[PDB]
Amino acid sequence: SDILGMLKSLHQLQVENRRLEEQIKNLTAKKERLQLLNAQLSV
Amino acid sequence: QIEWAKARVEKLRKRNQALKSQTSELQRQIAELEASNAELK
């Protein structure tokens, strides 16, 4: 009741938190594929 | 408790900033690899 404003703030941060962890996973997956291609062109 | 609610916001704000800064570093490493791959191709 007195905390509705901060509860809604936390809610948006919780949604953004899950987007950022998902984005990181997609970026480390990409980085791994780019790392394998870099190795194949290198060695 | 207002303070408890305030502190959940703060902690998750700090965490999301850590995630955003981890994405920046991931983006920079991806740029390093895509430049190196373009050069070696």
Side-chain angles (χ1 to χ4, degrees), chain A residues 3-22 24-43, chain B:
Chain A
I3 67 163
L4 259 204
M6 317 164 130
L7 185 57
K8 290 174 176 154
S9 282
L10 180 70
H11 283 172
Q12 170 175 332
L13 289 158
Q14 272 167 4
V15 162
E16 181 198 30
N17 169 270
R18 296 294 85 182
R19 265 203 300 104
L20 287 158
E21 297 260 35
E22 189 60 29
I24 288 189
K25 275 168 198 160
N26 292 329
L27 290 172
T28 72
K30 180 179 189 198
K31 173 168 114 87
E32 194 78 3
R33 300 189 305 271
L34 285 165
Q35 196 96 261
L36 163 66
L37 171 64
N38 195 260
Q40 291 184 333
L41 307 163
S42 285
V43 306
Chain B
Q1 202 80 75
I2 313 186
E3 289 69 57
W4 171 80
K6 183 178 171 220
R8 301 183 63 198
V9 169
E10 249 317 290
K11 169 179 186 194
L12 198 47
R13 184 194 77 63
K14 296 279 228 312
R15 170 62 175 172
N16 284 0
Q17 190 55 232
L19 296 177
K20 283 186 235 176
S21 147
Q22 191 185 6
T23 68
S24 297
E25 177 51 49
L26 280 171
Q27 293 289 4
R28 165 197 178 279
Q29 297 177 355
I30 288 163
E32 287 169 335
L33 284 157
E34 212 137 48
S36 164
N37 288 354
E39 171 165 22
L40 286 149
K41 248 163 192 176

